[PDB]
PDB file of N, CA and C in Angstrom:
ATOM      1  N   UNK B   1      89.186 119.578  78.749  1.00 15.74           N
ATOM      2  CA  UNK B   1      88.786 120.478  77.683  1.00 15.74           C
ATOM      3  C   UNK B   1      89.593 121.762  77.755  1.00 15.74           C
ATOM      4  N   UNK B   2      90.009 122.257  76.596  1.00 15.49           N
ATOM      5  CA  UNK B   2      90.728 123.520  76.535  1.00 15.49           C
ATOM      6  C   UNK B   2      89.736 124.665  76.666  1.00 15.49           C
ATOM      7  N   UNK B   3      89.935 125.502  77.677  1.00 15.14           N
ATOM      8  CA  UNK B   3      89.015 126.589  77.974  1.00 15.14           C
ATOM      9  C   UNK B   3      89.342 127.865  77.217  1.00 15.14           C
ATOM     10  N   UNK B   4      90.617 128.130  76.955  1.00 17.16           N
ATOM     11  CA  UNK B   4      91.030 129.346  76.277  1.00 17.16           C
ATOM     12  C   UNK B   4      91.764 128.974  74.999  1.00 17.16           C
ATOM     13  N   UNK B   5      91.885 129.952  74.116  1.00 13.25           N
ATOM     14  CA  UNK B   5      92.577 129.772  72.848  1.00 13.25           C
ATOM     15  C   UNK B   5      94.076 129.807  73.096  1.00 13.25           C
ATOM     16  N   UNK B   6      94.812 128.984  72.366  1.00 14.34           N
ATOM     17  CA  UNK B   6      96.254 128.928  72.532  1.00 14.34           C
ATOM     18  C   UNK B   6      96.870 130.272  72.173  1.00 14.34           C
ATOM     19  N   UNK B   7      97.596 130.911  73.081  1.00 15.47           N
ATOM     20  CA  UNK B   7      98.173 132.220  72.781  1.00 15.47           C
ATOM     21  C   UNK B   7      99.450 132.104  71.966  1.00 15.47           C
ATOM     22  N   UNK B   8      99.788 133.208  71.305  1.00 16.86           N
ATOM     23  CA  UNK B   8     101.009 133.268  70.515  1.00 16.86           C
ATOM     24  C   UNK B   8     102.252 133.435  71.371  1.00 16.86           C
ATOM     25  N   UNK B   9     102.099 133.895  72.608  1.00 16.13           N
ATOM     26  CA  UNK B   9     103.231 134.130  73.491  1.00 16.13           C
ATOM     27  C   UNK B   9     102.716 134.136  74.921  1.00 16.13           C
ATOM     28  N   UNK B  10     103.650 134.168  75.863  1.00 15.71           N
ATOM     29  CA  UNK B  10     103.327 134.173  77.279  1.00 15.71           C
ATOM     30  C   UNK B  10     104.069 135.303  77.969  1.00 15.71           C
ATOM     31  N   UNK B  11     103.392 135.967  78.899  1.00 14.29           N
ATOM     32  CA  UNK B  11     104.026 136.953  79.761  1.00 14.29           C
ATOM     33  C   UNK B  11     104.681 136.223  80.921  1.00 14.29           C
ATOM     34  N   UNK B  12     105.984 136.411  81.091  1.00 16.63           N
ATOM     35  CA  UNK B  12     106.697 135.715  82.145  1.00 16.63           C
ATOM     36  C   UNK B  12     107.769 136.607  82.741  1.00 16.63           C
ATOM     37  N   UNK B  13     108.161 136.253  83.961  1.00 17.91           N
ATOM     38  CA  UNK B  13     109.317 136.810  84.642  1.00 17.91           C
ATOM     39  C   UNK B  13     110.192 135.644  85.065  1.00 17.91           C
ATOM     40  N   UNK B  14     111.470 135.936  85.271  1.00 18.62           N
ATOM     41  CA  UNK B  14     112.472 134.935  85.610  1.00 18.62           C
ATOM     42  C   UNK B  14     112.768 135.022  87.097  1.00 18.62           C
ATOM     43  N   UNK B  15     112.837 133.869  87.753  1.00 20.44           N
ATOM     44  CA  UNK B  15     113.183 133.792  89.168  1.00 20.44           C
ATOM     45  C   UNK B  15     113.912 132.477  89.391  1.00 20.44           C
ATOM     46  N   UNK B  16     115.206 132.544  89.696  1.00 23.42           N
ATOM     47  CA  UNK B  16     116.011 131.347  89.898  1.00 23.42           C
ATOM     48  C   UNK B  16     116.602 131.273  91.298  1.00 23.42           C
ATOM     49  N   UNK B  17     115.938 131.849  92.293  1.00 23.13           N
ATOM     50  CA  UNK B  17     116.445 131.808  93.662  1.00 23.13           C
ATOM     51  C   UNK B  17     116.072 130.470  94.282  1.00 23.13           C
ATOM     52  N   UNK B  18     116.941 129.484  94.107  1.00 23.09           N
ATOM     53  CA  UNK B  18     116.695 128.167  94.662  1.00 23.09           C
ATOM     54  C   UNK B  18     116.903 128.181  96.169  1.00 23.09           C
ATOM     55  N   UNK B  19     116.140 127.342  96.857  1.00 24.23           N
ATOM     56  CA  UNK B  19     116.169 127.258  98.306  1.00 24.23           C
ATOM     57  C   UNK B  19     116.116 125.797  98.714  1.00 24.23           C
ATOM     58  N   UNK B  20     116.911 125.428  99.709  1.00 29.30           N
ATOM     59  CA  UNK B  20     116.838 124.110 100.321  1.00 29.30           C
ATOM     60  C   UNK B  20     116.688 124.297 101.819  1.00 29.30           C
ATOM     61  N   UNK B  21     115.674 123.668 102.402  1.00 24.74           N
ATOM     62  CA  UNK B  21     115.417 123.806 103.829  1.00 24.74           C
ATOM     63  C   UNK B  21     115.192 122.436 104.440  1.00 24.74           C
ATOM     64  N   UNK B  22     115.935 122.128 105.501  1.00 21.80           N
ATOM     65  CA  UNK B  22     115.813 120.864 106.214  1.00 21.80           C
ATOM     66  C   UNK B  22     115.620 121.133 107.698  1.00 21.80           C
ATOM     67  N   UNK B  23     114.623 120.489 108.296  1.00 19.47           N
ATOM     68  CA  UNK B  23     114.346 120.610 109.720  1.00 19.47           C
ATOM     69  C   UNK B  23     114.269 119.225 110.341  1.00 19.47           C
ATOM     70  N   UNK B  24     115.015 119.010 111.419  1.00 20.61           N
ATOM     71  CA  UNK B  24     114.975 117.769 112.180  1.00 20.61           C
ATOM     72  C   UNK B  24     114.615 118.087 113.622  1.00 20.61           C
ATOM     73  N   UNK B  25     113.717 117.298 114.200  1.00 16.49           N
ATOM     74  CA  UNK B  25     113.355 117.449 115.602  1.00 16.49           C
ATOM     75  C   UNK B  25     113.309 116.083 116.256  1.00 16.49           C
ATOM     76  N   UNK B  26     114.033 115.933 117.360  1.00 19.25           N
ATOM     77  CA  UNK B  26     114.037 114.712 118.148  1.00 19.25           C
ATOM     78  C   UNK B  26     113.651 115.030 119.584  1.00 19.25           C
ATOM     79  N   UNK B  27     112.841 114.161 120.175  1.00 21.05           N
ATOM     80  CA  UNK B  27     112.435 114.285 121.565  1.00 21.05           C
ATOM     81  C   UNK B  27     112.501 112.916 122.212  1.00 21.05           C
ATOM     82  N   UNK B  28     113.025 112.860 123.431  1.00 24.05           N
ATOM     83  CA  UNK B  28     113.045 111.638 124.220  1.00 24.05           C
ATOM     84  C   UNK B  28     112.500 111.930 125.607  1.00 24.05           C
ATOM     85  N   UNK B  29     111.919 110.909 126.222  1.00 20.13           N
ATOM     86  CA  UNK B  29     111.438 111.017 127.590  1.00 20.13           C
ATOM     87  C   UNK B  29     111.509 109.644 128.232  1.00 20.13           C
ATOM     88  N   UNK B  30     112.048 109.584 129.442  1.00 25.68           N
ATOM     89  CA  UNK B  30     112.156 108.346 130.196  1.00 25.68           C
ATOM     90  C   UNK B  30     111.700 108.608 131.620  1.00 25.68           C
ATOM     91  N   UNK B  31     110.990 107.649 132.204  1.00 26.54           N
ATOM     92  CA  UNK B  31     110.512 107.780 133.576  1.00 26.54           C
ATOM     93  C   UNK B  31     110.578 106.421 134.254  1.00 26.54           C
ATOM     94  N   UNK B  32     111.421 106.306 135.277  1.00 28.46           N
ATOM     95  CA  UNK B  32     111.592 105.083 136.049  1.00 28.46           C
ATOM     96  C   UNK B  32     111.079 105.308 137.465  1.00 28.46           C
ATOM     97  N   UNK B  33     110.240 104.398 137.939  1.00 26.13           N
ATOM     98  CA  UNK B  33     109.749 104.389 139.308  1.00 26.13           C
ATOM     99  C   UNK B  33     110.191 103.106 139.993  1.00 26.13           C
ATOM    100  N   UNK B  34     110.615 103.220 141.248  1.00 30.03           N
ATOM    101  CA  UNK B  34     111.023 102.068 142.039  1.00 30.03           C
ATOM    102  C   UNK B  34     110.402 102.168 143.420  1.00 30.03           C
ATOM    103  N   UNK B  35     109.903 101.048 143.929  1.00 28.62           N
ATOM    104  CA  UNK B  35     109.403 100.971 145.292  1.00 28.62           C
ATOM    105  C   UNK B  35     109.776  99.626 145.887  1.00 28.62           C
ATOM    106  N   UNK B  36     109.926  99.599 147.207  1.00 25.28           N
ATOM    107  CA  UNK B  36     110.216  98.361 147.909  1.00 25.28           C
ATOM    108  C   UNK B  36     109.766  98.492 149.355  1.00 25.28           C
ATOM    109  N   UNK B  37     109.396  97.356 149.936  1.00 24.09           N
ATOM    110  CA  UNK B  37     108.964  97.266 151.321  1.00 24.09           C
ATOM    111  C   UNK B  37     109.536  96.003 151.934  1.00 24.09           C
ATOM    112  N   UNK B  38     109.698  96.023 153.253  1.00 23.48           N
ATOM    113  CA  UNK B  38     109.923  94.801 154.005  1.00 23.48           C
ATOM    114  C   UNK B  38     109.256  94.934 155.363  1.00 23.48           C
ATOM    115  N   UNK B  39     108.711  93.827 155.849  1.00 23.42           N
ATOM    116  CA  UNK B  39     108.185  93.715 157.197  1.00 23.42           C
ATOM    117  C   UNK B  39     108.839  92.521 157.867  1.00 23.42           C
ATOM    118  N   UNK B  40     109.129  92.656 159.154  1.00 28.19           N
ATOM    119  CA  UNK B  40     109.692  91.565 159.928  1.00 28.19           C
ATOM    120  C   UNK B  40     108.980  91.490 161.265  1.00 28.19           C
ATOM    121  N   UNK B  41     108.817  90.272 161.769  1.00 27.72           N
ATOM    122  CA  UNK B  41     108.306  90.054 163.114  1.00 27.72           C
ATOM    123  C   UNK B  41     108.961  88.809 163.683  1.00 27.72           C
ATOM    124  N   UNK B  42     109.413  88.895 164.926  1.00 27.21           N
ATOM    125  CA  UNK B  42     109.994  87.764 165.631  1.00 27.21           C
ATOM    126  C   UNK B  42     109.359  87.680 167.008  1.00 27.21           C
ATOM    127  N   UNK B  43     109.061  86.461 167.449  1.00 29.35           N
ATOM    128  CA  UNK B  43     108.406  86.242 168.732  1.00 29.35           C
ATOM    129  C   UNK B  43     109.072  85.051 169.396  1.00 29.35           C
ATOM    130  N   UNK B  44     109.200  85.115 170.717  1.00 29.72           N
ATOM    131  CA  UNK B  44     109.817  84.037 171.470  1.00 29.72           C
ATOM    132  C   UNK B  44     109.163  83.958 172.837  1.00 29.72           C
ATOM    133  N   UNK B  45     108.860  82.737 173.266  1.00 28.40           N
ATOM    134  CA  UNK B  45     108.264  82.494 174.570  1.00 28.40           C
ATOM    135  C   UNK B  45     109.104  81.429 175.256  1.00 28.40           C
ATOM    136  N   UNK B  46     109.171  81.513 176.580  1.00 26.60           N
ATOM    137  CA  UNK B  46     110.065  80.644 177.325  1.00 26.60           C
ATOM    138  C   UNK B  46     109.413  80.246 178.638  1.00 26.60           C
ATOM    139  N   UNK B  47     109.975  79.211 179.242  1.00 22.19           N
ATOM    140  CA  UNK B  47     109.557  78.624 180.503  1.00 22.19           C
ATOM    141  C   UNK B  47     110.670  77.661 180.899  1.00 22.19           C
ATOM    142  N   UNK B  48     110.691  77.131 182.125  1.00 22.83           N
ATOM    143  CA  UNK B  48     111.725  76.143 182.464  1.00 22.83           C
ATOM    144  C   UNK B  48     111.497  74.777 181.845  1.00 22.83           C
TER     145      UNK B  48
ATOM    146  N   UNK S   1     138.129 134.969  80.945  1.00 27.05           N
ATOM    147  CA  UNK S   1     137.848 135.953  81.973  1.00 27.05           C
ATOM    148  C   UNK S   1     136.949 137.077  81.507  1.00 27.05           C
ATOM    149  N   UNK S   2     135.733 136.728  81.102  1.00 26.32           N
ATOM    150  CA  UNK S   2     134.767 137.705  80.629  1.00 26.32           C
ATOM    151  C   UNK S   2     134.188 138.500  81.793  1.00 26.32           C
ATOM    152  N   UNK S   3     133.836 139.748  81.509  1.00 23.43           N
ATOM    153  CA  UNK S   3     133.224 140.620  82.500  1.00 23.43           C
ATOM    154  C   UNK S   3     131.914 141.165  81.956  1.00 23.43           C
ATOM    155  N   UNK S   4     131.299 142.109  82.669  1.00 20.68           N
ATOM    156  CA  UNK S   4     130.075 142.718  82.165  1.00 20.68           C
ATOM    157  C   UNK S   4     130.316 143.457  80.860  1.00 20.68           C
ATOM    158  N   UNK S   5     131.545 143.915  80.622  1.00 19.51           N
ATOM    159  CA  UNK S   5     131.846 144.604  79.373  1.00 19.51           C
ATOM    160  C   UNK S   5     131.690 143.680  78.177  1.00 19.51           C
ATOM    161  N   UNK S   6     132.175 142.445  78.288  1.00 19.90           N
ATOM    162  CA  UNK S   6     132.031 141.501  77.188  1.00 19.90           C
ATOM    163  C   UNK S   6     130.573 141.123  76.974  1.00 19.90           C
ATOM    164  N   UNK S   7     129.794 141.057  78.052  1.00 19.58           N
ATOM    165  CA  UNK S   7     128.370 140.774  77.923  1.00 19.58           C
ATOM    166  C   UNK S   7     127.654 141.926  77.232  1.00 19.58           C
ATOM    167  N   UNK S   8     127.961 143.160  77.627  1.00 18.70           N
ATOM    168  CA  UNK S   8     127.223 144.309  77.123  1.00 18.70           C
ATOM    169  C   UNK S   8     127.570 144.598  75.669  1.00 18.70           C
ATOM    170  N   UNK S   9     128.800 144.317  75.251  1.00 22.51           N
ATOM    171  CA  UNK S   9     129.190 144.581  73.874  1.00 22.51           C
ATOM    172  C   UNK S   9     128.592 143.598  72.879  1.00 22.51           C
ATOM    173  N   UNK S  10     128.035 142.485  73.344  1.00 22.55           N
ATOM    174  CA  UNK S  10     127.425 141.487  72.480  1.00 22.55           C
ATOM    175  C   UNK S  10     125.916 141.606  72.583  1.00 22.55           C
ATOM    176  N   UNK S  11     125.202 141.938  71.504  1.00 22.27           N
ATOM    177  CA  UNK S  11     123.747 142.131  71.625  1.00 22.27           C
ATOM    178  C   UNK S  11     123.009 140.921  72.165  1.00 22.27           C
ATOM    179  N   UNK S  12     123.411 139.714  71.775  1.00 21.03           N
ATOM    180  CA  UNK S  12     122.735 138.520  72.268  1.00 21.03           C
ATOM    181  C   UNK S  12     122.926 138.363  73.770  1.00 21.03           C
ATOM    182  N   UNK S  13     124.166 138.487  74.242  1.00 21.66           N
ATOM    183  CA  UNK S  13     124.433 138.347  75.668  1.00 21.66           C
ATOM    184  C   UNK S  13     123.846 139.505  76.463  1.00 21.66           C
ATOM    185  N   UNK S  14     123.910 140.719  75.920  1.00 25.95           N
ATOM    186  CA  UNK S  14     123.317 141.862  76.602  1.00 25.95           C
ATOM    187  C   UNK S  14     121.818 141.678  76.771  1.00 25.95           C
ATOM    188  N   UNK S  15     121.139 141.221  75.722  1.00 31.67           N
ATOM    189  CA  UNK S  15     119.702 141.028  75.830  1.00 31.67           C
ATOM    190  C   UNK S  15     119.359 139.836  76.705  1.00 31.67           C
ATOM    191  N   UNK S  16     120.199 138.800  76.720  1.00 30.35           N
ATOM    192  CA  UNK S  16     119.973 137.702  77.652  1.00 30.35           C
ATOM    193  C   UNK S  16     120.077 138.180  79.091  1.00 30.35           C
ATOM    194  N   UNK S  17     121.071 139.019  79.384  1.00 31.26           N
ATOM    195  CA  UNK S  17     121.197 139.582  80.722  1.00 31.26           C
ATOM    196  C   UNK S  17     119.995 140.445  81.074  1.00 31.26           C
ATOM    197  N   UNK S  18     119.538 141.271  80.134  1.00 29.46           N
ATOM    198  CA  UNK S  18     118.388 142.129  80.397  1.00 29.46           C
ATOM    199  C   UNK S  18     117.139 141.293  80.655  1.00 29.46           C
ATOM    200  N   UNK S  19     116.919 140.261  79.839  1.00 29.06           N
ATOM    201  CA  UNK S  19     115.696 139.472  79.940  1.00 29.06           C
ATOM    202  C   UNK S  19     115.685 138.604  81.190  1.00 29.06           C
ATOM    203  N   UNK S  20     116.786 137.902  81.459  1.00 30.33           N
ATOM    204  CA  UNK S  20     116.817 136.966  82.575  1.00 30.33           C
ATOM    205  C   UNK S  20     116.754 137.658  83.923  1.00 30.33           C
ATOM    206  N   UNK S  21     116.904 138.976  83.963  1.00 27.39           N
ATOM    207  CA  UNK S  21     116.892 139.722  85.206  1.00 27.39           C
ATOM    208  C   UNK S  21     115.732 140.696  85.308  1.00 27.39           C
ATOM    209  N   UNK S  22     114.820 140.697  84.339  1.00 25.13           N
ATOM    210  CA  UNK S  22     113.645 141.567  84.351  1.00 25.13           C
ATOM    211  C   UNK S  22     114.038 143.031  84.501  1.00 25.13           C
ATOM    212  N   UNK S  23     115.086 143.443  83.789  1.00 24.67           N
ATOM    213  CA  UNK S  23     115.600 144.793  83.969  1.00 24.67           C
ATOM    214  C   UNK S  23     114.711 145.851  83.339  1.00 24.67           C
ATOM    215  N   UNK S  24     113.849 145.479  82.401  1.00 22.48           N
ATOM    216  CA  UNK S  24     112.930 146.429  81.795  1.00 22.48           C
ATOM    217  C   UNK S  24     111.598 146.502  82.516  1.00 22.48           C
ATOM    218  N   UNK S  25     111.412 145.723  83.573  1.00 20.90           N
ATOM    219  CA  UNK S  25     110.121 145.572  84.224  1.00 20.90           C
ATOM    220  C   UNK S  25     110.182 146.136  85.633  1.00 20.90           C
ATOM    221  N   UNK S  26     109.126 146.842  86.024  1.00 25.55           N
ATOM    222  CA  UNK S  26     109.029 147.393  87.355  1.00 25.55           C
ATOM    223  C   UNK S  26     108.717 146.331  88.386  1.00 25.55           C
ATOM    224  N   UNK S  27     108.537 146.781  89.621  1.00 24.51           N
ATOM    225  CA  UNK S  27     108.263 145.902  90.749  1.00 24.51           C
ATOM    226  C   UNK S  27     106.952 146.325  91.390  1.00 24.51           C
ATOM    227  N   UNK S  28     106.056 145.366  91.591  1.00 23.93           N
ATOM    228  CA  UNK S  28     104.758 145.611  92.205  1.00 23.93           C
ATOM    229  C   UNK S  28     104.938 145.465  93.710  1.00 23.93           C
ATOM    230  N   UNK S  29     104.709 146.555  94.443  1.00 23.94           N
ATOM    231  CA  UNK S  29     104.799 146.559  95.903  1.00 23.94           C
ATOM    232  C   UNK S  29     103.428 146.221  96.478  1.00 23.94           C
ATOM    233  N   UNK S  30     103.095 144.940  96.437  1.00 27.34           N
ATOM    234  CA  UNK S  30     101.868 144.477  97.045  1.00 27.34           C
ATOM    235  C   UNK S  30     102.000 144.300  98.545  1.00 27.34           C
ATOM    236  N   UNK S  31     100.845 144.182  99.204  1.00 25.16           N
ATOM    237  CA  UNK S  31     100.838 143.965 100.646  1.00 25.16           C
ATOM    238  C   UNK S  31     101.479 142.640 101.027  1.00 25.16           C
ATOM    239  N   UNK S  32     101.502 141.673 100.114  1.00 28.60           N
ATOM    240  CA  UNK S  32     102.190 140.412 100.350  1.00 28.60           C
ATOM    241  C   UNK S  32     103.686 140.497 100.088  1.00 28.60           C
ATOM    242  N   UNK S  33     104.173 141.604  99.536  1.00 30.43           N
ATOM    243  CA  UNK S  33     105.576 141.745  99.235  1.00 30.43           C
ATOM    244  C   UNK S  33     105.826 142.147  97.797  1.00 30.43           C
ATOM    245  N   UNK S  34     107.069 142.505  97.488  1.00 29.89           N
ATOM    246  CA  UNK S  34     107.400 142.919  96.122  1.00 29.89           C
ATOM    247  C   UNK S  34     107.459 141.735  95.173  1.00 29.89           C
ATOM    248  N   UNK S  35     106.890 141.917  93.986  1.00 28.77           N
ATOM    249  CA  UNK S  35     106.992 140.901  92.940  1.00 28.77           C
ATOM    250  C   UNK S  35     107.316 141.572  91.612  1.00 28.77           C
ATOM    251  N   UNK S  36     108.157 140.985  90.769  1.00 30.37           N
ATOM    252  CA  UNK S  36     108.442 141.610  89.475  1.00 30.37           C
ATOM    253  C   UNK S  36     107.207 141.639  88.590  1.00 30.37           C
ATOM    254  N   UNK S  37     107.091 142.699  87.802  1.00 30.59           N
ATOM    255  CA  UNK S  37     105.979 142.821  86.875  1.00 30.59           C
ATOM    256  C   UNK S  37     106.281 142.070  85.587  1.00 30.59           C
ATOM    257  N   UNK S  38     105.233 141.548  84.958  1.00 30.90           N
ATOM    258  CA  UNK S  38     105.392 140.872  83.679  1.00 30.90           C
ATOM    259  C   UNK S  38     105.364 141.825  82.498  1.00 30.90           C
TER     260      UNK S  38
END
């Protein structure tokens, strides 16, 4: 619904300052874990 | 190679320059910043 009566003219100002803005953000993260174990046992028994 | 002189000597171009730049209108110094008046 039209709330106001159509005016004969409009009050305006001119502004043509165009702007372009681009932002890029990259993030990386890497985490490597390594573990290792070894156990050894040797036994020897003798007699004649 | 037109200059401001060629614009000003022509009423249509002079008034286009005046209108498109709000040269007859003051500036409202609001707390949010300056804005041209209508």
